[PDB]
């Protein structure tokens, strides 16, 4: 399953396995990793609209973000990714869809979008949570005298 996943989304699997957020891609039967530069949360700005006014029917499938590496660094354009990853290239374009509701992970919560327009941020707990974990309530044999 891990082989199949690393073929699917090599970034996440490499980040989990290596132990740190790292960009990855398969080189056949091996993975090439490269550590990702962390960016402060306060240095990230979301553009309100995911539309592309220059062309009809084409929408950014994932919110645009402007960010700066340092608190005074130049503002750098980019596009949001998964698990708060910022992609330097704004290329994830999809045809625009009616009834377009989306929640995107952003910092500690989500950034709800409607009709390719920013609606509001959401706290992490504002959305019902389902657990893929399986509880193993192993308590400990208490000391007995």
């Amino acid at each position: 399953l891990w082989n199949e996943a690393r073929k699917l989304n090599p970034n996440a699997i490499a980040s989990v396995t290596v132990g740190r957020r790292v960009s990855a891609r398969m080189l056949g039967d091996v993975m090439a990793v490269s550590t990702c530069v962390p960016v402060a949360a306060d240095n990230v700005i979301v553009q309100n609209s995911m539309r592309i006014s220059s062309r009809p029917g084409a929408c950014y499938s994932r919110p645009l973000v402007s960010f700066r590496y340092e608190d005074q660094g130049p503002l750098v354009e980019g596009q949001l990714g998964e698990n708060n990853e910022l992609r330097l290239t704004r290329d994830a374009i999809e045809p625009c869809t009616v009834g377009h509701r989306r929640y995107f992970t952003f910092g500690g919560g989500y950034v709800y979008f409607e009709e390719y327009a920013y609606s509001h941020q959401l706290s992490r707990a504002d959305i019902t949570t389902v657990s893929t974990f399986i509880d193993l309530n192993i308590t400990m044999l208490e000391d007995h005298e």
Partner: antibody
Amino acid sequence: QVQLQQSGPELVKPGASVKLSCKASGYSFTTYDINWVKERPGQGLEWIGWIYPREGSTNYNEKFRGKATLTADTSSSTAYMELHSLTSEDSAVYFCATYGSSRYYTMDYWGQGTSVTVSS
Amino acid sequence: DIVLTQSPTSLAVSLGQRATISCRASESVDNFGISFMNWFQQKPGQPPKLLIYAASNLGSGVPARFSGSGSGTDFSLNIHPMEDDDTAMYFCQQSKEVPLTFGAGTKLELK
């Protein structure tokens, strides 16, 4: 349930300027583009531009730089036309349209239309 | 710009049989594997209505007798059977690039 009110017919002197209106109703006016389409019976129906109410941004068909102009009033939930230098041939029907039912962004909601005329 | 041509400028058709028109886009209008071709019918005096979007998807509130096909630059509209409700004016148009245009137009009437 989604309705696009429009102004009535206009009798105008050629070369003047007018203001057509598209009162949107039945949905959040700011969340969908408002397209304007020119309709003269002689020629095929012609798209002149569309305006994004939420941002106020708009793209026009190229030939309609100064002849047409679009504004939007979110408070009134109404997009507006600003026609300028109305030539005799500019006398035509103008449709205001938007998206909302078809899965992709297509002009599937329409107003009753507005027949503008210029004469003497 | 994308220019749209329809082989029948007018097409008289009797009731009940196949009705077919064509639409040419003079170049590709396909993006994301989707042909951004849309078909409109306009009964005279009232605003046009969507019939087919993405060149194959039936517009809502439309009988299945309407049917569309095509990809690349050639697109076609198929109707069967054709009824009095189809005696209208029809437009094929694209939504690929910003100055999106419309077809010259097809007229369907009775022989």
